[PDB]
Amino acid sequence: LRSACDTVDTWLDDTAKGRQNISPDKIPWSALKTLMAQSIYGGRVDNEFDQRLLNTFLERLFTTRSFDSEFKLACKVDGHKDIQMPDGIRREEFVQWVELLPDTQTPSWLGLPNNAERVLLTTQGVDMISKMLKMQPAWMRTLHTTASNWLHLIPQTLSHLKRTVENIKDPLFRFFEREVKMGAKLLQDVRQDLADVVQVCEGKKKQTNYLRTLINELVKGILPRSWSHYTVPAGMTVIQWVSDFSERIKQLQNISLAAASGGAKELKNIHVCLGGLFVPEAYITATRQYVAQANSWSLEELCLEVNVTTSQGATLDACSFGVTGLKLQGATCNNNKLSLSNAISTALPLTQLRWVKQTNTEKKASVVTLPVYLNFTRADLIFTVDFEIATKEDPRSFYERGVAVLCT
Amino acid sequence: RGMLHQDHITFAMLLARIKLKGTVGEPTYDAEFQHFLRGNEIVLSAGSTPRIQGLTVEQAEAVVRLSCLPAFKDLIAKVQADEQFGIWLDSSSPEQTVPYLWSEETPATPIGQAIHRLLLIQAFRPDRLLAMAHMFVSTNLGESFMSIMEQPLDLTHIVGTEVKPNTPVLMCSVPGYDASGHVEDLAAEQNTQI
Amino acid sequence: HPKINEWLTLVEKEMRVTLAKLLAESVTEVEIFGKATSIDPNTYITWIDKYQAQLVVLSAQIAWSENVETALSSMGGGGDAAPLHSVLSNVEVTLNVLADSVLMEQPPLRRRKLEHLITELVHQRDVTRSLIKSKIDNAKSFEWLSQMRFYFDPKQTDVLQQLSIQMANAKFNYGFEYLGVQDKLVQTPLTDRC
Amino acid sequence: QSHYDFGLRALKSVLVSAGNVKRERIQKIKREKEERGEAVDEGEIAENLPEQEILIQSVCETMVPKLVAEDIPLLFSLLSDVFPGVQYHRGEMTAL
Ligand SMILES: Nc1ncnc2c1ncn2[C@@H]1O[C@H](COP(=O)(O)OP(=O)(O)O)[C@@H](O)[C@H]1O
């Protein structure tokens, strides 16, 4: 804030050499916007979509239109009202306007959907209840049962892919090779550890240091560090990890079974879930490489367009792949068009990722690019998708509301 | 002034309860407060909870737990009878317009009415609980009770009068915040070398 | 000055002053190559060999900055034609000469000078293309101000204060430290933001 | 693998090695043409210069030693895919 005020002072003194009044157009809007988007506030930003949102806010607020009587500081604060730009010309009246703001504030003041703070307020209320209230061997058998249930739930077999002279040239095979190999290694390690835990809980084999640490982590429900190999949300228990790992092993089993019989043809035509893949971005680049190799093109001239089907199981072209499990946050998809929604998430049934040659044409001013994050933490960016907004929406409003796609 | 902003409501509500216990003309409200604190611990079987139209499983569970209170014995009948109840349940700020769904043999004081709307808010719209709690405090301690907590902190008067030289001024900041600039500015204003 | 520190200080000061004077001579020699349509490769290579690598790149930057500044000043009326293309053309032909010079065998020092010049002229070409595409017609516009610009004032009594580097808010003087032959970086957009 | 790196440092090392390899190939071709007959021209040498072979040689000189056994066929397949036709003949250090 101090840096931004200093920038405003310096540029206003430079533009206005002591003059009492200047036209709003003569104000260096571009200088302030660029310095605040690249140096002052954009310096901390290390994400392209955060920088996009910062640019959106700066281009909304810091223009000459802010000096008119009709300027809206915020819109759709409650669906009916909006925040008006004060018409004052002195500090006192601006402070008076600030002191007269309504006490009720919603995330729509910030451009976010109103349902953004529902979970936060619910958790805060539960915490307030807990704080008000606050200031007013069997473990062997339980672990044995838990580990037996885990072993029964977890699959058993995952065979490696079969390398061949013509199989190596296929990027899909090159990536599913890593996937199946890592899955088999993790499966074997986890099953061996769980069997050792079961045998320890029966008093049949002596507990060792590794077994001691593993059991200590298991009884208190922390994911063992020897099992955590792929990216997962930080605060995830061991039950959830076991379930997710079982689902991933089932999906990899289907992948291996399909690839074993038929070759690379059904390999192209297999339905995959990006959330279950260990490195989904490698899958995306492998499909890009496959399309490029089939068409004898380059990767950098291939762009991706997404087509959300109304149903699962539709046939695919030679340059389109099908992925499932994607979730759209804060918006709904109908007929490949996005509408701003007040729901938390909408399950995309099946989306076709299609690679086509770039036409070097600019977007149609109604197309939004949405990040596809791995999980709800939005810490990993897998890739970007392009949709077209509804007939009466705004891409800027899409950016301000944090619309994004999650792989799981 | 030395508490995180999330714990202001807890201390204010405890002060409101303390003042309530000191009011000659008010009931003690032991049962309602005890339920408000420890009603989620009431064990109920899956079959005991019915499916009330317009209410999810969590809201229905909260309703059937809250029905144990004498004033909410026929809560299910009242919510089913009132058809415009869904409009309130999907309101932006339902706490401002909590409907009268509790039976009383006598017109309760505004404070007890506040506890009743607060229990209803917890059962129906837990996300709007805090705001409801705030209004509860306003009924017990005044609307301005929290007002000073919304204004910028006034270091001048506090360090000039309320702070003894023996008592150090501990300035605890969450990461990303530093109070050194505030102290330097304060010393600059008073023309005191620091 | 038999004392080690005295004559070492004299050597450092004379290094700075000599570099400043050599830069002045380099600028007054390269202003022929700039502001022109055709460049003879032989005299350009002679100028490159005569002067220091850092001084050569600095003189190229000064010449391009002055050319763009005068071109923008000539369009202060808004409706005037665009001489920036000529400036761009100048850069183009210079780059072509440089592109021809590295295609054949060169001495290692002159080869490194040529690579530095190629990098700097590629950056200048990109900046000029960006200016032309955005239709910049004012020298006070931020699209030109945001760029790093070099100004040489031959009528300054102090040789060390003759060159000024400005990037949209900041006034720096060249330190005239002898950097030898450094490994220049490609001026990516991230480098410009930095 | 823990010792794999394909960032900006590896890329810049590959580029500098490519420049050095191009220079040494130019010198070797020049010496061969001086010793065999008498005809040298900078433009002719530049036109008949296998730059893709130079990049492939630099990549295999820097990236191949770090690869594990199974990744060598994979990397050569990627080389064939991104650089079709070109092949890398490793130098023979007879005296060494
Ligand atoms: N703009 C650039 N042009 C040319 N080379 C660059 C550029 N930026 C970085 N590099 C190269 O990348 C390598 C790594 O950069 P480095 O200074 O080590 O970054 P860090 O300090 O983050 O480790 C360096 O050898 C440098 O030569």
Curated annotation (Swiss-Prot), chain C:
It is found in: Cytoplasm, Cytoskeleton. Signal peptide: none annotated. Cytoplasmic dynein 1 acts as a motor for the intracellular retrograde motility of vesicles and organelles along microtubules. Dynein has ATPase activity; the force-producing power stroke is thought to occur on release of ADP. Plays a role in mitotic spindle assembly and metaphase plate congression. Homodimer. The cytoplasmic dynein 1 complex consists of two catalytic heavy chains (HCs) and a number of non-catalytic subunits presented by intermediate chains (ICs), light intermediate chains (LICs) and light chains (LCs); the composition seems to vary in respect to the IC, LIC and LC composition. The heavy chain homodimer serves as a scaffold for the probable homodimeric assembly of the respective non-catalytic subunits. The ICs and LICs bind directly to the HC dimer and dynein LCs assemble on the IC dimer. Interacts with DYNC1LI1; DYNC1LI1 and DYNC1LI2 bind mutually exclusive to DYNC1H1. It is linked to Charcot-Marie-Tooth disease, axonal, type 2O: An axonal form of Charcot-Marie-Tooth disease, a disorder of the peripheral nervous system, characterized by progressive weakness and atrophy, initially of the peroneal muscles and later of the distal muscles of the arms. Charcot-Marie-Tooth disease is classified in two main groups on the basis of electrophysiologic properties and histopathology: primary peripheral demyelinating neuropathies (designated CMT1 when they are dominantly inherited) and primary peripheral axonal neuropathies (CMT2). Cortical dysplasia, complex, with other brain malformations 13: An autosomal dominant disorder characterized by global developmental delay with impaired intellectual development. Some patients show signs of peripheral neuropathy, such as abnormal gait and hyporeflexia. CDCBM13 is associated with variable neuronal migration defects resulting in cortical malformations. Dynein heavy chains probably consist of an N-terminal stem (which binds cargo and interacts with other dynein components), and the head or motor domain. The motor contains six tandemly-linked AAA domains in the head, which form a ring. A stalk-like structure (formed by two of the coiled coil domains) protrudes between AAA 4 and AAA 5 and terminates in a microtubule-binding site. A seventh domain may also contribute to this ring; it is not clear whether the N-terminus or the C-terminus forms this extra domain. Belongs to the dynein heavy chain family. This is Cytoplasmic dynein 1 heavy chain 1. It comes from Homo sapiens. The gene is DYNC1H1.
